[PDB]
Design a protein around this ligand. Structure first.
Ligand SMILES: C[C@]12CCC(=O)C[C@@H]1CC[C@@H]1[C@@H]2CC[C@]2(C)[C@@H](O)CC[C@@H]12
Length: 243
């Protein structure tokens, strides 16, 4: 299980948000902490991605683009997994020091988005997703959103995505057909959630001053340069099933 060995080996560890749980729950503090959590996770996602089998075959500009477009989905998926394995989807486990209960989902002004995320988390249980399945699915998420006009070296990307899809089917192995169908359906469901968060973070960045919400360096640049390309339709997610 060479492929599975690698994915398990490179899987990022625990990342705290640095939230002061002693201070009252407020939109400002919660979102600021989420943004800081995102900055920290971004660092881990970059190291993880670059250590993925074949990732370095991609053109260098494509390497960063793929990461900059797929980070929302990747982080939402892993967070849903953490919520499943830690609190059985009861709450959203963003970090050990930033767990969202219903009250926080409301104060964050992202209640509808959190609902979709908790639903995603519940799916891990309803589908009995295995740790091994989780890992391959997460890897595939990195190769699930690109420029409609293509990447610098689209062929390298296509071969890479193909091989990761084949690995998912592999660990899966009538029954297998049902399983693959279900996991690809689950993967597709991540995209709508990611787009809602893209829209939300974009709007929040634009009015960040007014509501006292702080965005760290990497987050601000990516959200003002990359995210708009997605919201304007220049960059679109890759779906398995027709939407
Ligand atoms: C990706 C993060 C942080 C990592 C995670 O566990 C998932 C979570 C999903 C909501 C994101 C948050 C990062 C900061 C964002 C983008 C806020 O600006 C609004 C939505 C937040």
């Amino acid at each position: 299980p060479i492929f599975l060995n690698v994915l398990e080996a490179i899987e990022p560890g625990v990342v705290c948000a640095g939230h002061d749980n002693n201070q009252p729950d407020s939109f400002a503090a919660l979102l600021s902490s989420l943004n800081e959590l995102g900055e920290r996770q971004l660092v881990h996602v970059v190291k993880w991605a670059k250590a993925l089998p074949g990732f370095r075959n991609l053109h260098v500009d494509d390497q960063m683009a793929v990461i900059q477009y797929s980070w929302m989905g990747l982080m939402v998926f892993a967070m849903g997994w953490r919520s499943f394995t830690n609190v059985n989807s009861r709450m959203l486990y963003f970090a050990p020091d930033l767990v969202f209960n219903e009250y926080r989902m409301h104060k964050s002004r992202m209640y509808s988005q959190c609902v979709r995320m908790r639903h995603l988390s519940q799916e891990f249980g309803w589908l009995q997703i295995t740790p091994q399945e989780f890992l391959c699915m997460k890897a595939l998420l990195l190769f699930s959103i690109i420029p409609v006009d293509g990447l610098k070296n689209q062929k390298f990307f296509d071969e890479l995505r193909m091989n990761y899809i084949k690995e998912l089917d592999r660990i899966i192995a009538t029954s297998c057909s049902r399983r693959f169908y279900q996991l690809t359906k689950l993967l597709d469901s991540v995209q709508p959630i990611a787009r809602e968060l893209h829209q939300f973070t974009f709007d929040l960045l634009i009015k960040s001053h007014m509501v006292s919400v702080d965005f760290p360096e990497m987050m601000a640049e990516i959200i003002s340069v990359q995210v708009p390309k997605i919201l304007s339709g220049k960059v679109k997610p890759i779906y398995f099933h027709t939407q």
